[PDB]
C-alpha cells in the first residue's frame, strides 16, 4: 500500500496556487522533470503444501482431527428503546446539513469460514462527501 | 493498492489554480515532463498442493476429519422501539440536507463458506456525494 | 506501507503558494528535477509446508487433535434506553452541520474462521468529508 493518501482540499505534482491579487509578470519557470515510477510489488512464489493425514499405512483409527466450532457472532445489537414520551420538536432549520436519528451502517465482510485461501484480499471503503456549499 | 486516494476538492498533475484578481503576463512556463509509470504487481507463482488423507494404505477407519460448524452470525439486529408517544414535529426547513430516521445499510459480503479460494478478492465501496449547493 | 499520508489542505511536489498581494516579476525559476521512485516490495518466497499427522505407521488411535471453539463475539451492544420523558427541543439552527442521535457504524471484517491463509490482506477505510462551506 504505497500511497494511502488523504489530501485535504487538493493535490498536485507541480502547482501554482496563486489566489489573491498579485501583479506578476516576466517569469520564465523552465521545468525539466523526469518523474519515473516503478512498481514491482507482490511477487508471490509460494509452495503451500498443506495436507492432512498423509499416510496412515497400517490400522490407525483416527477421529475428530479438526473440530472448528460451534460459534456465534451476534455483532450488531443496537437495542435502543428511546422512549422520549413527550416530543415537542419545534425545529426551525437554516441551511444546515442535519442528520437526525439515522443509522449509517457499512458492514463489509469477506473470506469467512474458508478452509484455505491463497492470493490476497482487499477491502477499500470510501465515505460520504456531503458538501452543502450553502450561500 | 498503490493510490488509495481521497483528494478533497481536486487533483491535478500540473495545475495553475489562479482564482482571484491577478494581472499576469509575459510568462514562458516551459514544461518538459516524462511521467512514465510502470506497474508489475501481483505475479503469483503458487503451487498450493492442498490435500486430505493422501494414502490410507492399510485398514484405518477414519472419522470426523473436518467438522466446521455449527455456527450463527445474526449480524444486524437494530431492535429500536422508539415509542415517542407524543410527536409534535412542527419542522420548518430551509435549504438543508436533512436525513430523518433513515437506515443506510451497505452489507457487502463475499467468499463465504468456501472450502478453498485461490487468486484474489476485491471489495471497493464508494459513498454518497449529496451536494445540495443551495443559494 | 510507504506513504500513509494525511495532508491537511494540500500536497504538491513543487508548488508556488502565492496568495496575497505581491508584485513579483522577472524571475527565472529554472528547475531541473529527476524524481525517480523504485518500489521492489513484498517479494514472498515462502514454503509453508503445513501438515497434520503425517505418518501414523502402526496402530495409533488419535483423537481431538484440534478443537478450536466454542466461542462467541457479541461485539456491538449499544443497549441505550434514552428515556428522556419530557422533550421540548425548540431547536433553531443556522448554517451548522448537525448530527443528532446518529449511529455511524463501519464494521469491516475479513479472513474470519479460515484454517489457513497465505498471501496478504488489506483493509483501507476513508471517512466522510462533510464540507458545509456556508456563507
Ligand atoms: C516586464 O518586461 C518588459 C520587457 O522587458 C519590461 O519593459 C517591463 O518593465 C517588465 N515589467 C515591469 C513591471 O517592469
Ligand atoms: C532534462 O532531463 C533529462 C533527464 O535527466 C535529461 O536527459 C535532459 O538532458 C534534460 N534536458 C535539459 C535541457 O535540461
Ligand atoms: C520460485 O521458486 C522456485 C522454487 O525454488 C525457483 O525454482 C524459482 O526460480 C523461483 N522464482 C522466482 C521468480 O523467485
Ligand atoms: C467429536 O466432536 C464432537 C463434537 O461435539 C463430539 O460430539 C464427539 O463426541 C467427538 N468424538 C469423540 C470420540 O469424542
Ligand atoms: C509584457 O511584454 C511587453 C513586450 O515585451 C512589454 O512591453 C510589457 O511592458 C510587459 N508587461 C508589462 C506590464 O510591463
Ligand atoms: C525532455 O525530456 C526528455 C526526457 O528526459 C529528454 O530526452 C529531452 O532531451 C528533453 N528535451 C528538452 C528540450 O529538454
Ligand atoms: C515459477 O515457479 C516454477 C517452479 O519452481 C519455476 O520453474 C518458474 O521459473 C517460476 N516462474 C516465475 C516467473 O517465477
Ligand atoms: C462427528 O461429529 C458429529 C457432529 O456433532 C457428532 O454428532 C458425531 O458423534 C461425531 N462422531 C464421533 C465418532 O464422535
Ligand atoms: C523587470 O525587468 C525589466 C527589463 O529588464 C526592467 O526594466 C524592470 O525594471 C524590472 N522590474 C522592476 C520592477 O524594476
Ligand atoms: C538535469 O538533470 C539530469 C539528471 O541529473 C542531468 O542528466 C542533466 O545533465 C541535467 N541538465 C541540466 C541542464 O542541468
Ligand atoms: C526462492 O527460494 C528457493 C528455495 O531455496 C530458491 O531456489 C530461489 O532461488 C529463491 N528465489 C528468490 C527470488 O529468492
Ligand atoms: C473431544 O472434544 C469434544 C468437544 O467438547 C468433547 O465432547 C469430547 O469428549 C472430546 N473427546 C474426548 C475423547 O475427550
Curated annotation (Swiss-Prot), chains A, B, C:
Effect seen on changing residue 94 to A: Decreased number of infected cells by SARS-CoV-2. No effect on infection with HCoV-229E
Topological region Lumenal: 1-135
Compartment(s) of residence: Late endosome membrane; Lysosome membrane; Cell membrane
Positions of glycan attachment: 26, 32, 45, 64
Domain of life: Eukaryota
Chain's role: In neurons, involved in the transport of late endosomes/lysosomes. May be involved in dendrite morphogenesis and maintenance by regulating lysosomal trafficking. May act as a molecular brake for retrograde transport of late endosomes/lysosomes, possibly via its interaction with MAP6. In motoneurons, may mediate the axonal transport of lysosomes and axonal sorting at the initial segment. (Microbial infection) Plays a role in human coronavirus SARS-CoV-2 infection, but not in common cold coronaviruses HCoV-229E and HCoV-OC43 infections. Involved in ACE2-independent SARS-CoV-2 cell entry. Required for post-endocytic stage of virus entry, facilitates spike-mediated membrane fusion. Virus attachment and endocytosis can also be mediated by other cell surface receptors.
Disease cited in the entry: Frontotemporal dementia 2: A form of dementia characterized by pathologic finding of frontotemporal lobar degeneration, presenile dementia with behavioral changes, deterioration of cognitive capacities and loss of memory. Gestural apraxia, parkinsonism, visual loss, and visual hallucinations are present in 25 to 40% of patients. Frontotemporal dementia and/or amyotrophic lateral sclerosis 1: An autosomal dominant neurodegenerative disorder characterized by adult onset of frontotemporal dementia and/or amyotrophic lateral sclerosis in an affected individual. There is high intrafamilial variation. Frontotemporal dementia is characterized by frontal and temporal lobe atrophy associated with neuronal loss, gliosis, and dementia. Patients exhibit progressive changes in social, behavioral, and/or language function.
Listed name of the protein: Transmembrane protein 106B
Organism this protein belongs to: Homo sapiens (Human)
Lineage: Eukaryota, Metazoa, Chordata, Craniata, Vertebrata
Name of the gene: TMEM106B
Full-length numbering of the shown residues: 120 to 254 of 274
